[PDB]
Amino acid sequence: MASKQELDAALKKAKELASSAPVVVFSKTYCGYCNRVKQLLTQVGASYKVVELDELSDGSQLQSALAHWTGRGTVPNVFIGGKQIGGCDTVVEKHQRNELLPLLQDAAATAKNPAQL
């Protein structure tokens, strides 16, 4: 039998992780892009979980479930309100469009606005 139930369990934990905070940043321990996304969200004033898949106890299979789930599985990988937004380039582009910030506000993730967008 293939590892289907292990992949499904990692997928279930990926959904759990993706929903454990209003914003979640699947990442790795050293990448400049992971640092960039952390600083991007910090500067607007967001509140976000970080999930360093190089250090998470099952992080390799968790990233494999991420790839299965998203058809992408890159790092960093950003979710808001339990839905994927995209990777580093996606959040930087949506920040430049002033399009990420309204969605962070809608999630009330920006602590500046607890009343939502």
TrEMBL record:
Predominant localisation class: cytoplasm
A UniProt-annotated Pfam family: Glutaredoxin
Positions annotated to bind [2Fe-2S] cluster: C31
PROSITE patterns with a match to the protein in the record: GLUTAREDOXIN_2 (PS51354)
Domain of life of the native organism: Eukaryota
MF terms in GO: 2 iron, 2 sulfur cluster binding; glutathione disulfide oxidoreductase activity; identical protein binding; metal ion binding
Record's keyword terms, sorted: 2Fe-2S, Cytoplasm, Electron transport, Iron, Iron-sulfur, Metal-binding, Redox-active center, Transport
Residues reported to bind glutathione: K28, V75, C88, D89
Subcellular location: Cytoplasm
CDD domains membership: GRX_GRXh_1_2_like (cd03419)
Glutaredoxin domain location: 23-85
Gene Ontology cellular component annotations, sorted alphabetically: cytoplasm
UniProt-listed GO biological process terms: cellular response to oxidative stress
Entry similarity comment: Belongs to the glutaredoxin family. CPYC subfamily.
Identification of the protein by name: Glutaredoxin
